[PDB]
Short mmCIF file of C-alpha atoms in Angstrom, two decimals:
data_model
loop_
_atom_site.label_atom_id
_atom_site.label_comp_id
_atom_site.label_asym_id
_atom_site.label_seq_id
_atom_site.Cartn_x
_atom_site.Cartn_y
_atom_site.Cartn_z
CA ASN A 1 -48.97 -1.64 4.55
CA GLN A 2 -48.11 -4.09 7.32
CA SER A 3 -44.78 -5.63 8.35
CA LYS A 4 -42.93 -8.09 6.15
CA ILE A 5 -40.01 -10.49 6.49
CA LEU A 6 -37.25 -9.44 4.09
CA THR A 7 -35.94 -12.97 3.51
CA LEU A 8 -36.83 -16.60 4.28
CA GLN A 9 -33.66 -17.87 5.95
CA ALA A 10 -31.67 -15.90 8.52
CA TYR A 11 -28.26 -14.43 7.82
CA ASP A 12 -25.58 -16.66 9.37
CA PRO A 13 -22.05 -15.31 9.97
CA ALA A 14 -20.48 -18.77 9.70
CA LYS A 15 -21.99 -19.19 6.23
CA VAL A 16 -19.78 -16.35 4.94
CA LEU A 17 -16.75 -18.00 3.33
CA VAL A 18 -13.43 -16.19 2.89
CA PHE A 19 -10.80 -17.64 0.55
CA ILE A 20 -7.23 -16.38 0.20
CA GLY A 21 -4.94 -18.25 -2.18
CA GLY A 22 -7.36 -21.17 -2.28
CA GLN A 23 -7.84 -22.02 1.40
CA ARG A 24 -10.68 -21.07 3.72
CA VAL A 25 -9.72 -18.70 6.53
CA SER A 26 -10.64 -19.41 10.15
CA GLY A 27 -9.87 -17.49 13.32
CA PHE A 28 -12.07 -14.41 13.17
CA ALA A 29 -12.59 -12.33 16.30
CA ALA A 30 -14.80 -9.80 18.10
CA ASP A 31 -17.99 -8.70 16.28
CA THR A 32 -16.68 -7.75 12.82
CA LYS A 33 -15.27 -10.35 10.44
CA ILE A 34 -14.47 -8.37 7.28
CA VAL A 35 -14.98 -4.79 6.08
CA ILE A 36 -14.89 -4.00 2.35
CA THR A 37 -14.53 -0.37 1.29
CA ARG A 38 -13.49 1.70 -1.71
CA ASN A 39 -10.85 4.41 -1.96
CA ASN A 40 -12.50 6.99 -4.24
CA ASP A 41 -16.04 7.91 -5.19
CA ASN A 42 -17.57 6.64 -8.42
CA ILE A 43 -18.34 10.08 -9.88
CA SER A 44 -16.95 13.56 -9.23
CA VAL A 45 -19.12 16.61 -9.94
CA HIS A 46 -18.03 20.04 -11.16
CA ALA A 47 -20.05 23.24 -11.13
CA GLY A 48 -20.25 25.49 -14.16
CA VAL A 49 -20.42 29.24 -14.73
CA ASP A 50 -24.03 29.14 -15.96
CA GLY A 51 -25.64 26.26 -14.05
CA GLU A 52 -24.37 23.32 -16.11
CA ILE A 53 -23.30 20.20 -14.22
CA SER A 54 -20.59 17.96 -15.70
CA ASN A 55 -20.05 14.46 -14.32
CA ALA A 56 -16.98 12.28 -14.85
CA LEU A 57 -16.81 8.56 -14.16
CA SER A 58 -13.83 7.32 -12.17
CA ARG A 59 -11.44 4.78 -13.67
CA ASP A 60 -9.81 3.66 -10.39
CA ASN A 61 -11.45 0.74 -8.58
CA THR A 62 -8.94 -0.34 -5.93
CA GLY A 63 -10.17 -0.90 -2.40
CA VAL A 64 -9.28 -2.23 1.04
CA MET A 65 -10.43 -5.28 2.99
CA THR A 66 -9.85 -5.39 6.76
CA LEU A 67 -9.54 -8.92 8.16
CA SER A 68 -9.92 -9.21 11.94
CA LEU A 69 -8.20 -12.21 13.55
CA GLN A 70 -7.14 -13.40 16.98
CA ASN A 71 -3.44 -13.53 17.69
CA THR A 72 -3.76 -17.27 18.34
CA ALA A 73 -4.59 -18.22 14.73
CA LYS A 74 -2.17 -19.95 12.38
CA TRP A 75 -3.24 -17.73 9.49
CA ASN A 76 -1.20 -14.99 11.15
CA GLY A 77 1.89 -17.11 10.59
CA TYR A 78 0.76 -17.93 7.06
CA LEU A 79 0.43 -14.24 6.20
CA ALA A 80 3.76 -13.36 7.82
CA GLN A 81 5.57 -16.07 5.85
CA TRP A 82 3.86 -14.94 2.64
CA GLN A 83 4.92 -11.35 3.30
CA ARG A 84 8.55 -12.35 3.83
CA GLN A 85 8.55 -14.48 0.68
CA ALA A 86 6.97 -11.70 -1.38
CA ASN A 87 9.56 -9.23 -0.14
CA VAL A 88 12.39 -11.62 -1.02
CA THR A 89 11.22 -12.65 -4.52
CA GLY A 90 8.58 -10.26 -5.85
CA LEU A 91 5.36 -12.22 -6.30
CA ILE A 92 2.69 -10.42 -4.27
CA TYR A 93 -0.56 -11.09 -6.14
CA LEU A 94 -2.90 -13.88 -4.98
CA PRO A 95 -6.61 -14.50 -5.57
CA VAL A 96 -9.22 -13.39 -3.03
CA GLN A 97 -12.85 -14.51 -2.91
CA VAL A 98 -15.63 -13.79 -0.40
CA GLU A 99 -18.96 -15.62 -0.68
CA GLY A 100 -21.55 -13.65 1.26
CA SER A 101 -24.79 -15.01 2.67
CA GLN A 102 -27.95 -13.14 1.66
CA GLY A 103 -25.69 -10.32 0.55
CA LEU A 104 -23.23 -9.10 -2.03
CA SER A 105 -20.07 -11.05 -2.83
CA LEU A 106 -16.58 -10.41 -4.19
CA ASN A 107 -14.16 -12.14 -6.57
CA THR A 108 -10.88 -10.46 -7.51
CA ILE A 109 -7.10 -10.50 -7.00
CA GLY A 110 -5.63 -9.06 -3.80
CA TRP A 111 -2.40 -8.33 -1.97
CA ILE A 112 -1.16 -7.64 1.56
CA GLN A 113 -1.03 -3.91 2.27
CA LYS A 114 -0.08 -3.20 5.89
CA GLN A 115 0.93 -5.47 8.74
CA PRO A 116 -1.13 -4.95 11.92
CA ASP A 117 0.23 -4.13 15.38
CA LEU A 118 0.54 -6.72 18.14
CA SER A 119 -0.57 -5.83 21.66
CA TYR A 120 0.10 -8.30 24.47
CA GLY A 121 -2.23 -7.43 27.33
CA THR A 122 -4.37 -9.01 30.03
CA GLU A 123 -6.98 -10.30 27.56
CA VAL A 124 -6.53 -11.89 24.14
CA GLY A 125 -5.69 -9.28 21.53
CA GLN A 126 -6.93 -8.61 18.00
CA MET A 127 -4.97 -8.14 14.78
CA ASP A 128 -6.48 -6.43 11.72
CA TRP A 129 -4.94 -7.17 8.32
CA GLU A 130 -5.50 -4.65 5.52
CA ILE A 131 -5.79 -6.59 2.25
CA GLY A 132 -5.92 -4.44 -0.87
CA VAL A 133 -7.95 -5.66 -3.83
CA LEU A 134 -7.79 -4.74 -7.51
CA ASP A 135 -11.51 -4.52 -8.26
CA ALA A 136 -14.00 -3.71 -5.52
CA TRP A 137 -17.34 -3.94 -7.34
CA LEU A 138 -19.76 -6.10 -5.36
CA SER A 139 -21.69 -8.70 -7.34
CA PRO A 140 -25.32 -9.70 -6.71
CA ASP A 141 -24.60 -13.26 -7.95
CA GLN A 142 -26.60 -15.55 -5.57
CA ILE A 143 -29.49 -13.09 -5.32
CA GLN A 144 -32.14 -14.13 -7.84
CA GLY A 145 -34.46 -11.99 -9.92
CA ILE A 146 -31.88 -9.30 -10.67
CA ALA A 147 -31.62 -9.57 -14.46
CA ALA A 148 -35.33 -8.85 -14.87
CA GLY A 149 -35.21 -5.97 -12.40
CA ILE A 150 -32.29 -4.27 -14.14
CA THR A 151 -34.21 -3.96 -17.41
CA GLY A 152 -37.15 -2.48 -15.51
CA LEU A 153 -35.48 0.81 -14.61
CA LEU A 154 -36.38 3.77 -16.81
CA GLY A 155 -34.13 6.76 -17.49
CA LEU A 156 -33.26 9.47 -19.99
CA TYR B 1 -10.63 36.78 -31.79
CA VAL B 2 -7.93 34.27 -32.74
CA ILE B 3 -6.71 31.33 -30.67
CA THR B 4 -3.07 31.58 -29.58
CA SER B 5 -2.75 28.57 -27.25
CA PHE B 6 -4.71 25.74 -25.68
CA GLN B 7 -3.93 22.84 -23.37
CA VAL B 8 -5.36 19.34 -22.95
CA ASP B 9 -4.64 16.78 -20.25
CA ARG B 10 -6.09 13.59 -18.73
CA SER B 11 -5.12 13.46 -15.06
CA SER B 12 -5.71 10.45 -12.80
CA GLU B 13 -8.56 12.30 -11.09
CA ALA B 14 -11.66 13.12 -13.14
CA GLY B 15 -11.09 10.08 -15.34
CA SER B 16 -13.14 9.67 -18.52
CA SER B 17 -12.92 13.42 -19.16
CA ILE B 18 -10.44 16.07 -20.32
CA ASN B 19 -9.67 19.54 -18.99
CA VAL B 20 -9.32 22.23 -21.65
CA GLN B 21 -7.89 25.75 -21.51
CA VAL B 22 -8.03 28.36 -24.27
CA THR B 23 -6.65 31.85 -24.84
CA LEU B 24 -7.79 34.46 -27.36
CA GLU B 25 -6.78 37.99 -28.36
CA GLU B 26 -8.37 40.75 -30.40
CA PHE B 27 -7.53 41.20 -34.10
CA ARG B 28 -7.47 44.76 -35.45
CA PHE B 29 -8.05 43.66 -39.06
CA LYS B 30 -8.30 46.48 -41.59
CA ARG B 31 -11.25 39.26 -57.05
CA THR B 32 -14.97 39.43 -57.81
CA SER B 33 -16.02 42.93 -56.76
CA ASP B 34 -18.50 45.54 -57.90
CA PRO B 35 -16.76 47.95 -60.33
CA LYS B 36 -18.50 50.79 -58.49
CA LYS B 37 -16.55 49.86 -55.34
CA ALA B 38 -13.25 49.37 -57.18
CA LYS B 39 -10.21 51.47 -56.31
CA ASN B 40 -6.95 52.00 -58.17
CA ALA B 41 -4.50 49.28 -57.15
CA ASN B 42 -0.93 48.29 -57.97
CA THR B 43 1.07 45.12 -58.54
CA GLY B 44 4.61 46.46 -58.98
CA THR B 45 6.88 45.30 -61.76
CA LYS B 46 5.75 42.09 -63.45
CA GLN B 47 7.50 39.56 -65.68
CA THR B 48 6.29 36.88 -68.09
CA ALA B 49 3.22 35.35 -66.46
CA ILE C 1 55.51 7.07 -8.61
CA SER C 2 56.80 3.58 -9.39
CA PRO C 3 56.95 1.20 -12.37
CA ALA C 4 54.08 -0.78 -10.82
CA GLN C 5 51.96 2.38 -10.65
CA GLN C 6 52.31 2.70 -14.43
CA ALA C 7 50.18 -0.42 -14.81
CA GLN C 8 47.52 1.13 -12.57
CA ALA C 9 47.56 4.28 -14.71
CA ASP C 10 47.15 2.15 -17.84
CA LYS C 11 44.02 0.53 -16.40
CA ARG C 12 42.32 3.92 -16.10
CA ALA C 13 42.92 4.74 -19.76
CA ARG C 14 41.73 1.34 -21.00
CA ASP C 15 38.63 0.77 -18.87
CA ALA C 16 37.48 4.39 -19.16
CA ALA C 17 38.11 4.36 -22.91
CA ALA C 18 36.49 0.94 -23.37
CA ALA C 19 33.34 2.21 -21.64
CA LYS C 20 32.68 4.95 -24.21
CA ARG C 21 33.36 2.59 -27.11
CA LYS C 22 30.45 0.36 -26.08
CA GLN C 23 28.18 3.39 -25.75
CA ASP C 24 29.48 5.12 -28.88
CA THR C 25 29.31 2.08 -31.19
CA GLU C 26 25.79 1.20 -30.04
CA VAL C 27 24.61 4.74 -30.82
CA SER C 28 26.36 4.49 -34.19
CA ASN C 29 24.36 1.34 -34.92
CA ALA C 30 21.26 3.48 -34.49
CA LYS C 31 20.84 6.15 -37.16
CA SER C 32 22.08 3.40 -39.49
CA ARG C 33 19.02 1.15 -39.26
CA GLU C 34 16.16 2.83 -41.13
CA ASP C 35 13.80 -0.18 -41.10
CA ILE C 36 13.10 0.23 -37.37
CA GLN C 37 10.31 2.27 -35.81
CA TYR C 38 9.54 2.95 -32.15
CA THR C 39 6.04 3.53 -30.79
CA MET C 40 4.95 4.42 -27.25
CA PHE C 41 1.49 3.48 -25.95
CA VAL C 42 0.76 6.20 -23.42
CA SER C 43 -2.92 5.22 -23.11
CA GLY C 44 -5.95 3.82 -24.91
CA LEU C 45 -4.54 0.30 -25.04
CA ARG C 46 -7.65 -1.15 -23.39
CA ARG C 47 -10.04 1.05 -25.44
CA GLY C 48 -9.92 0.67 -29.21
CA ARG C 49 -6.17 1.10 -29.63
CA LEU C 50 -5.64 -2.63 -29.04
CA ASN D 1 -20.03 -26.10 11.75
CA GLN D 2 -19.91 -26.05 15.55
CA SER D 3 -17.60 -24.21 17.95
CA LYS D 4 -13.92 -25.06 18.26
CA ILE D 5 -11.05 -24.25 20.61
CA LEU D 6 -8.35 -22.39 18.70
CA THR D 7 -5.47 -23.74 20.79
CA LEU D 8 -4.76 -26.32 23.49
CA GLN D 9 -3.05 -24.23 26.18
CA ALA D 10 -4.19 -20.77 27.22
CA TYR D 11 -2.26 -17.62 26.43
CA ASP D 12 -0.35 -16.50 29.53
CA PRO D 13 0.97 -12.92 29.81
CA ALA D 14 3.81 -13.94 32.13
CA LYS D 15 5.05 -16.42 29.52
CA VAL D 16 5.89 -13.52 27.18
CA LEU D 17 9.62 -12.82 27.64
CA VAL D 18 11.17 -9.44 26.80
CA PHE D 19 14.96 -9.16 26.51
CA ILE D 20 16.89 -5.90 26.15
CA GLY D 21 20.68 -6.12 26.02
CA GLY D 22 20.56 -9.69 27.34
CA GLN D 23 18.50 -9.35 30.52
CA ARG D 24 14.83 -10.10 31.08
CA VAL D 25 12.68 -7.07 31.85
CA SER D 26 10.30 -6.99 34.81
CA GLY D 27 8.02 -4.26 36.09
CA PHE D 28 5.19 -4.05 33.58
CA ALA D 29 2.03 -2.16 34.48
CA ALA D 30 -1.68 -1.67 33.76
CA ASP D 31 -3.23 -3.93 31.08
CA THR D 32 -0.81 -3.52 28.16
CA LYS D 33 2.75 -4.83 28.32
CA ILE D 34 4.18 -4.08 24.87
CA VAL D 35 2.83 -2.68 21.59
CA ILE D 36 4.69 -3.35 18.33
CA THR D 37 3.81 -1.25 15.29
CA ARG D 38 5.25 -0.22 11.94
CA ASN D 39 5.83 3.26 10.54
CA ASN D 40 4.84 2.87 6.87
CA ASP D 41 2.64 0.53 4.88
CA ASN D 42 4.14 -2.40 2.99
CA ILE D 43 2.84 -1.36 -0.45
CA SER D 44 1.70 1.96 -1.91
CA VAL D 45 -0.76 1.98 -4.81
CA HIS D 46 -0.98 4.45 -7.70
CA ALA D 47 -3.86 4.90 -10.12
CA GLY D 48 -3.29 5.13 -13.85
CA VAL D 49 -4.87 7.08 -16.71
CA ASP D 50 -6.46 3.98 -18.26
CA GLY D 51 -7.26 1.69 -15.32
CA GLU D 52 -3.81 0.18 -14.73
CA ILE D 53 -2.71 -0.30 -11.11
CA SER D 54 1.00 -0.16 -10.25
CA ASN D 55 2.22 -1.42 -6.88
CA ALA D 56 5.58 -0.65 -5.28
CA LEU D 57 7.08 -2.55 -2.36
CA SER D 58 8.45 -0.47 0.50
CA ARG D 59 12.11 -0.75 1.48
CA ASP D 60 11.80 0.84 4.96
CA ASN D 61 11.07 -1.53 7.84
CA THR D 62 11.67 0.51 11.00
CA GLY D 63 9.08 0.42 13.74
CA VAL D 64 8.28 1.38 17.32
CA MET D 65 7.84 -0.66 20.50
CA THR D 66 6.08 0.92 23.48
CA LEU D 67 7.15 -0.53 26.84
CA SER D 68 4.83 0.25 29.77
CA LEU D 69 6.45 0.22 33.21
CA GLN D 70 5.71 1.39 36.73
CA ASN D 71 7.78 4.24 38.07
CA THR D 72 8.98 1.97 40.88
CA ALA D 73 11.00 -0.38 38.65
CA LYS D 74 14.80 -0.41 38.48
CA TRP D 75 14.71 -0.80 34.70
CA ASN D 76 13.77 2.88 34.59
CA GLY D 77 17.14 3.68 36.13
CA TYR D 78 18.85 1.22 33.81
CA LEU D 79 17.37 2.91 30.75
CA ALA D 80 18.18 6.40 32.04
CA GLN D 81 21.82 5.46 32.67
CA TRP D 82 22.04 3.85 29.23
CA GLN D 83 20.62 7.00 27.63
CA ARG D 84 23.16 9.22 29.37
CA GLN D 85 26.03 6.92 28.40
CA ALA D 86 24.87 6.76 24.77
CA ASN D 87 24.66 10.55 24.63
CA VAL D 88 28.17 10.89 26.05
CA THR D 89 29.94 8.28 23.88
CA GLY D 90 27.85 7.36 20.84
CA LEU D 91 26.94 3.68 21.14
CA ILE D 92 23.15 3.48 20.96
CA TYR D 93 22.43 0.09 19.37
CA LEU D 94 21.56 -2.91 21.54
CA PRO D 95 19.77 -6.19 20.77
CA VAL D 96 16.06 -6.61 21.44
CA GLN D 97 14.14 -9.89 21.53
CA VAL D 98 10.51 -10.67 22.39
CA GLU D 99 9.37 -14.30 22.70
CA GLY D 100 5.60 -14.37 22.38
CA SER D 101 3.30 -17.10 23.65
CA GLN D 102 0.93 -18.61 21.08
CA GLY D 103 1.70 -15.62 18.90
CA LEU D 104 4.24 -13.93 16.69
CA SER D 105 7.71 -13.05 17.96
CA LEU D 106 10.48 -10.56 17.22
CA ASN D 107 14.28 -10.61 17.04
CA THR D 108 16.19 -7.51 15.91
CA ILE D 109 18.37 -4.60 17.06
CA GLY D 110 16.77 -1.63 18.80
CA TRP D 111 17.46 1.76 20.34
CA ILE D 112 15.89 4.23 22.76
CA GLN D 113 13.76 6.79 20.93
CA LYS D 114 11.93 9.09 23.36
CA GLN D 115 12.01 9.38 27.13
CA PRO D 116 8.55 9.23 28.76
CA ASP D 117 7.02 11.83 31.07
CA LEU D 118 6.86 11.39 34.84
CA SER D 119 3.64 12.26 36.67
CA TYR D 120 3.63 12.17 40.47
CA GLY D 121 0.01 11.91 41.58
CA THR D 122 -2.21 10.28 44.18
CA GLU D 123 -1.85 6.80 42.66
CA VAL D 124 1.20 5.06 41.22
CA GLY D 125 2.02 6.40 37.77
CA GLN D 126 2.95 4.75 34.47
CA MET D 127 5.90 5.43 32.16
CA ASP D 128 5.88 4.36 28.50
CA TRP D 129 9.23 3.94 26.75
CA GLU D 130 9.30 4.14 22.95
CA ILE D 131 11.95 1.70 21.70
CA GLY D 132 12.65 1.89 17.97
CA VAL D 133 13.64 -1.29 16.16
CA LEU D 134 15.45 -1.81 12.86
CA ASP D 135 13.36 -4.63 11.44
CA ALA D 136 9.74 -5.08 12.47
CA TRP D 137 8.72 -8.25 10.60
CA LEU D 138 7.02 -10.67 12.98
CA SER D 139 8.17 -14.28 12.79
CA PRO D 140 5.90 -17.33 13.18
CA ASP D 141 8.80 -19.35 14.67
CA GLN D 142 7.20 -21.42 17.52
CA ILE D 143 3.98 -21.97 15.56
CA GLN D 144 4.22 -25.34 13.83
CA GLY D 145 2.89 -26.42 10.46
CA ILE D 146 3.73 -23.17 8.69
CA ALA D 147 6.25 -24.36 6.09
CA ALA D 148 3.71 -26.78 4.60
CA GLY D 149 0.96 -24.15 4.62
CA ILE D 150 3.08 -21.56 2.81
CA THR D 151 3.59 -23.83 -0.20
CA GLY D 152 -0.16 -24.48 -0.31
CA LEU D 153 -1.17 -20.99 -1.41
CA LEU D 154 -1.89 -20.58 -5.12
CA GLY D 155 -1.45 -17.35 -7.09
CA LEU D 156 -0.72 -15.89 -10.51
#
């Protein structure tokens, strides 16, 4: 076969929308906006004494989301104030939504995990917020023609 | 072999499954019956039945 | 010792004694109510046991 | 959307003021003045046996502050004398304040943790003092329009 264009419109980093609490977030830095990862694998395998393989689904779905920002953005102050308020009162849970472009998306409830480290140097620094999320299953959503494809897979 | 103990648990890891342990030991075991196989038996003293 | 110190001694007896009365009477209330049952939901709440 | 300037005035490294005991500190080196970091995460997560997630806030807020100086600065002698005096008598706690420019700031009480290592070589060396601080929560302070933004976040 010959070459083929995977999509019709190009992936645009500015088209990726990040919402925390209900407000869009601006002030990203460097060449990595967000990184979404899980904490544990989906299935753990165990060997047997006579060749049998037993698989067990995992029931933990927490994950981490690293947000990279410049230290000149007001969202740094927003997050710091939220952290102080949460420590004082107790409310720590806020909604988190990420609308990807030509890619998977996320919609769950998150919290602030670890405060980054400042570094005042010659250039402008970078702060990386770890935001933990309850459910970390990515959703096809915008991508079309998925319902038909799912029923196409065979298995026994 | 008779079962003397077993354990079941559902730890955080390996969710959706259960780990099982068992222990067994030997048993040195030693009516409607054919009269040809019958043997003299006893029942001790008996009262009104 | 002093007459004033007698009052301080009396406080020990009262407050210490009053503490056990609250614990003891509450326990006595239990074992008297037979129309009460306690259940603990260790797991399964989100699967069938709802 | 198009490009946008995050701020109006540029971040200036000399505008960052560091105060220890009540005197400004001069003699920084290389391309990193100070580094502020925490010791533990803000929240630790635990998995359940049927999908529940339980979160626990941390009650420890100590941190570290690395101060980079040339070995030709008098503040090296100041810190050495302070360390000797603290060892002899017992007073080790002194105030520490850092006023950031277009960034987060700090105001707490600190102490001297570990003495750096000298290295006499061909070039001029660098000594890094670890200063431990009681509270390491960064404060928006100078940044304006934070009180209104904090009340804007939704959550349940």
